[PDB]
Amino acid sequence: DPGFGSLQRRLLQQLYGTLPTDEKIIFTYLQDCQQEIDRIIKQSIIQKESHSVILVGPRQSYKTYLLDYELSLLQQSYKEQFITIRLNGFIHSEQTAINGIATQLEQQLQKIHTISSGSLTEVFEKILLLLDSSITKITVVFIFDEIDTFAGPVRQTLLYNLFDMVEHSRVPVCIFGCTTKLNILEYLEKRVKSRFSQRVIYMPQIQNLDDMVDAVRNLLTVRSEISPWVSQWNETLEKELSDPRSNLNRHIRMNFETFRSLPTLKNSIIPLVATSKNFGSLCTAIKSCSFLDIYNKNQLSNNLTGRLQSLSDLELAILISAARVALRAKDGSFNFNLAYAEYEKMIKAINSRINTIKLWLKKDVKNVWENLVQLDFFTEKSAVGLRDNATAAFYASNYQFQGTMIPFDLRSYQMQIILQELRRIIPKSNMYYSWTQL
Amino acid sequence: CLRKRIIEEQITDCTDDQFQNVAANFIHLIVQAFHSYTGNDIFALNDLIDFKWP
Numbered sequence: 001d002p003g004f005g006s007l008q009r010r011l012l013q014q015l016y017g018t019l020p021t022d023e024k025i026i027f028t029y030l031q032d033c034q035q036e037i038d039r040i041i042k043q044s045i046i047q048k049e050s051h052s053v054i055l056v057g058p059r060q061s062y063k064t065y066l067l068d069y070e071l072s073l074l075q076q077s078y079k080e081q082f083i084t085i086r087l088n089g090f091i092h093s094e095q096t097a098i099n100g101i102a103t104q105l106e107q108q109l110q111k112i113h114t115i116s117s118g119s120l121t122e123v124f125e126k127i128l129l130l131l132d133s134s135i136t137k138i139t140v141v142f143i144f145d146e147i148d149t150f151a152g153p154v155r156q157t158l159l160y161n162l163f164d165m166v167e168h169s170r171v172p173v174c175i176f177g178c179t180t181k182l183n184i185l186e187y188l189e190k191r192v193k194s195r196f197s198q199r200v201i202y203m204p205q206i207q208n209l210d211d212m213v214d215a216v217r218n219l220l221t222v223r224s225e226i227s228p229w230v231s232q233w234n235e236t237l238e239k240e241l242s243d244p245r246s247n248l249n250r251h252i253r254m255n256f257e258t259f260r261s262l263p264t265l266k267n268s269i270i271p272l273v274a275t276s277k278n279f280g281s282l283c284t285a286i287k288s289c290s291f292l293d294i295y296n297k298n299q300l301s302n303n304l305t306g307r308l309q310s311l312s313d314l315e316l317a318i319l320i321s322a323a324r325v326a327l328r329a330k331d332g333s334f335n336f337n338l339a340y341a342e343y344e345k346m347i348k349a350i351n352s353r354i355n356t357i358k359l360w361l362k363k364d365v366k367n368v369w370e371n372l373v374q375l376d377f378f379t380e381k382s383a384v385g386l387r388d389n390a391t392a393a394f395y396a397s398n399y400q401f402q403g404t405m406i407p408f409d410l411r412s413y414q415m416q417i418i419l420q421e422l423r424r425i426i427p428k429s430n431m432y433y434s435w436t437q438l
Numbered sequence: 439c440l441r442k443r444i445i446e447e448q449i450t451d452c453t454d455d456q457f458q459n460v461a462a463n464f465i466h467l468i469v470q471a472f473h474s475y476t477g478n479d480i481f482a483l484n485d486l487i488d489f490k491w492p
């Protein structure tokens with residue numbers, strides 16, 4: 001029937017946030033901080049004042065969401081009175097930020113009615129005579145995303161020039177910095193701090209469990225009457241949220257003590273609403289929550305326990321022997337020779353008490369050994385993983401490490417999973433379970 | 439290599455089931471023989487089946 005698909009599409013659109021900007025919801029715990037952003041940004045597109053704020057809050061804490069809600073709320077009327085310059089702190093390095101501002105000043109003033117061209121000096125001067133220099137001007141709203149990379153501990157030239165065209169300019173600017181560091185004012189060089197308006201507004205977090213169930217109530221209820229089922233779907237929702245002993249409130253309660261975040265709940269709820277096929281099926285699927293434990297089991301299906309569960313028998317004996325050898329050493333290192341000199345000893349003690357276990361030769365335990373470093377059960381001795389930036393992953397791509405030039409069975413590996421954590425997770429009905437004690 | 443063996447050996451007591459059952463039995467033989475060697479990897483079984491078939 002084409003009656004159920006409208007309800008499902010409306011529910012998933014509310015769950016993604018892709019509504020039109022008149023029924024787009026704002027949760028109650030972030031309605032005060034949306035008022036401050038609305039106050040700041042509404043006295044720069046209208047009153048043409050200039051200032052600079054920094055939004056501090058963790059990841060998925062609704063900073064780009066609130067800012068795009070304002071910039072789509074200040075566009076239904078005052079479309080022609082502002083242009084937006086959005087730039088990240090990841091995809092815009094401090095030399096490629098100038099080309100970003102020049103390309104986004106050029107193509108935005110085109111859509112209203114060549115500054116992109118030249119070298120870096122000519123482009124940086126072409127956008128310093130444009131901004132640093134009854135009628136109404138045009139304001140520029142700068143959106144700096146992850147501003148804690150432009151505030152590096154060397155120069156801070158882009159921040160000095162952007163915060164310097166706040167006091168000392170004729171063009172009204174309003175620059176938003178979304179970051180994640182709580183110690184963001186300690187980053188700034190002491191002459192970029194003096195140009196800064198010092199108005200850093202911290203995003204709100206969830207203080208109560210009532211805020212979370214009110215947020216889920218705001219997200220899943222339906223306001224516009226599109227499908228015939230909505231008159232049930234609201235009420236059958238509230239029966240799950242008012243009763244504090246149901247499954248949905250219990251999953252919200254265990255979300256409040258774990259990762260205290262609404263987008264994890266959104267990614268839980270979305271394949272529940274989208275895999276359902278009928279309205280009664282959706283109703284009993286949100287009654288029982290038959291999917292928030294299928295999905296939540298699958299999210300842990302291979303970390304260090306759901307893929308050790310899928311180990312084979314020789315691989316398990318090799319892992320147990322290697323953890324025994326690392327437990328016996330001082331600092332926790334071993335190699336293939338010290339591991340195979342425990343596999344054959346353990347299996348000879350298995351065949352001593354008794355029908356048996358076939359001892360695989362060291363020509364076939366090499367494949368097992370390579371299959372337990374491609375599942376991350378062993379690391380090397382001091383091998384750091386992925387490097388932090390892109391140059392340190394280049395500086396080491398030209399280095400020829402000593403741990404890869406020595407022969408294979410002498411590389412000093414290191415355990416990912418100690419023998420105590422191996423004792424409790426192997427079932428007690430195993431033929432090696434007694435061998436996890438020491 | 440099997441469809442020339444059925445005529446090299448003068449085999450007339452065969453049908454398609456009589457080929458697919460020995461194929462599945464060979465695959466189960468490689469599995470119960472070599473699963474403790476490889477692990478749960480389809481790629482390390484595919485090439486063992488490719489080697490030990492003819």
Ligand SMILES: Nc1ncnc2c1ncn2[C@@H]1O[C@H](COP(=O)(O)OP(=O)(O)OP(O)(O)=S)[C@@H](O)[C@H]1O
Nearest residue numbers: 016017018057058059060061062063064065068263
């Ligand atoms: N412009 C947007 N339109 C619709 N939904 C959005 C938008 N921006 C973010 N969301 C959603 O809002 C939730 C989190 O919002 P975000 O703005 O990405 O959080 P955040 O503060 O931007 O994280 P950052 O930028 O890394 S600090 C997610 O469910 C996003 O899918």
Ligand SMILES: [Mg+2]
Nearest residue numbers: 064145146178
């Ligand atoms: Mg952001």
